[PDB]
Amino acid sequence: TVRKNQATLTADEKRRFVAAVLELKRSGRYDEFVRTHNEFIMSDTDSGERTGHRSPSFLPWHRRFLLDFEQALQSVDSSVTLPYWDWSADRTVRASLWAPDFLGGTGRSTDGRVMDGPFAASTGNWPINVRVDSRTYLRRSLGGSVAELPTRAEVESVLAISAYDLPPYNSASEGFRNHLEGWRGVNLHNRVHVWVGGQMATGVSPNDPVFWLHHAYVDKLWAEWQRRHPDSAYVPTGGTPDVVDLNETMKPWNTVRPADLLDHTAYYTFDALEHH
Amino acid sequence: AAPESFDEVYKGRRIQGRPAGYEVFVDGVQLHVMRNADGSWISVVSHYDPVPTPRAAARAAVDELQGAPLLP
């Protein structure tokens, strides 16, 4: 019930996380998370209904999506929690993240295929089934399409933004949510997807297990923003067309509101989270 | 006011775009694309990476695909 920095996992925790992810894949459950995410990112538009992306509910929606996935992991092995990837710190291909005992490395030159780790196509254990093209193998090009992951100083600049979100509550917004998402400013969350490349750069980005670790750290940064800004909170707070207001429920669950997801501590804690 | 249509061969592949609110095709297979508020574009195979135009999104898809057929 503690989410830990990936860099701190023990060999046994890495093993159990890998095995639980692979069992959700085998049983068919994993692919439906990939599908859900793609459906939402293909439908979340700036000029219409938007829930999982490009909108204030980007953060609570991914928080609940990650909770669904973590609960599915825990049904296979109750000891497993989602770890997080602090990409401001572990910013090279040399990070133990990308070691063959954890997620495997970058893809080869020719076709971007990941050739090592538990998710390499050659293992037979990670078919890419939910996809936008014919290729059925995990791909990555770490640092190929953008040179650099965000730095801590860039992160700090975003954490300093006091307003949670602003009209028009889309990819054009000023404020924290859209700078954290990355459509404006120095670009945190979007740029990491682009830096990993392969399926992580696409609508079917949960095909790469690093998806979860990236979003767990995005989620941690929301929690950090909250501590920096106890006087700020989720907006909008009612009556906003096409956007999920604080007390409105969110699709696909329909039974939970951003209000139910602001306080992570109802569901989990971090290994380390600074006091305000 | 939609962008103009286009049709060219880019890296051996035919990319087409036309207003619909805008459709893109790679070798006759529709590619999901979306316009951002600021006028930039993305496709489903580059969905976190804004590019200025639909043709730019089509070319980015051809770059991404490395010869692979798109799936509907």
Ligand SMILES: [Cu+2]
């Ligand atoms: Cu889209």
Ligand SMILES: [Cu+2]
């Ligand atoms: Cu997403």
Ligand SMILES: [Cu+2]
């Ligand atoms: Cu994302």
Ligand SMILES: [Cu+2]
């Ligand atoms: Cu204070």
